C-alpha cells in the first residue's frame with residue numbers, strides 16, 4: 294500500500 | 305541553546321511559507337478586507353453556488369451535496385501534497401526509514417488538514433479556491449445527511465482553535481510537532497522520531513513564550529489540542545467509512561483511499 298505517498302516522499 | 309531553537313523556528317516558518325500558498329496571514333487579510341482585489345465570491349445557497357461554480361472551479365449531473373464533497377476531497381488531496389513537501393523540510397525527516405515517513409504522514413495529514421482549515425475559517429464560513437471563494441458555514445451545515453455533519457465538525461474545531469490566536473510562525477512548529485509523533489501505530493524506529501519531536505517541542509515552547517508573553521497556558525493547551533485532534537480525525541475517518549458504504553455515487557480519491565486504508 295501507499296504507492297502514491299512513497300513517490301511523493303521521494304522527490 | 306535557544307539560538308539554535310530560534311533558527312529552527314525560522315527555518316520551519318520559511319519552509320511553511322514555501323509549502324503552503326494560502327497562509328493564515330493572507331487568509332485573515334481576505335476575511336477582513338486588507339486586500340482591495342476582488343473579494344471572494346460568496347456562496348451561501350443553491351442559487352449562489354450554481355453561478356459561482358466557475359470562480360471556485362478552475363459532469364454537472366451529480367447532486368450538490370456530492371459535488372461539494374468531491375470538492376473537499378480534491379482540496380484535501382492538494383493539501384496532502386503540500387503537507388508532504390513541508391514534512392520533508394523538517395530536519396531529520398527524510399533520513400527516517402521511508403516506511404516510517406509514510407506512516408507519519410498516513411496518521412498525521414488529516415490532523416494537519418483540520419489545523420490548517422481553521423486558518424481559512426471564521427464563524428461564518430471557509431475560504432476556498434485559493435481565497436477566490438467563500439462558502440458559508442450555514443450552507444455547508446445544511447447539506448443533506450450525512451454530508452452536513454461531515455462539514456460541521458471542521459468548523460467546530462476551527463472556532464475553538466482560532467480562539468488561541470496562533471500565527472503562521474506558531475503554526476509552522478505546531479504542525480511539525482504533530483507530524484513527528486513517535487507513537488503512531490506501526491512505526492519501526494521510534495527513538496529517532498521522538499528525538500526530533502523533543503527538539504521541536506522545545507522550539508514550540510520557546511516560540512510561544514516569546515510570541516505570546518501574556519498567555520502562559522498556550523503550550524499546554526496546544527499539547528491537548530494534539531490529543532484532541534486524534535479523536536477528531538478518528539471520527540472523520542469513521543463518518544467517511546459510513547459515506548463510502550452508504551452512498552452509491554462515491555468516487556473516493558485514490559490518495560485518500562490509500563491513506564484511510566487500514567487506518568486502525
Ligand SMILES: COc1cc(O)c2c(c1C(=O)NCc1cccc3ccccc13)OC1=CC(O)=C(C(C)=O)C(=O)[C@]12C
Pocket residue numbers: 360361362371372374375376377378379380421430431432433439444454455456458459
Ligand atoms: C466546502 O469546501 C469546498 C467546496 C468546494 O466546492 C471546493 C473546495 C472546498 C474546500 O477547499 N474545502 C476543504 C475541506 C476539506 C475537507 C473537509 C472540509 C470540511 C469543511 C470545509 C472544508 C473542507 O475546494 C475545491 C476543490 C476543487 O478542486 C473543486 C473542483 C470541483 O474542481 C471544488 O469543488 C472546490 C472549489
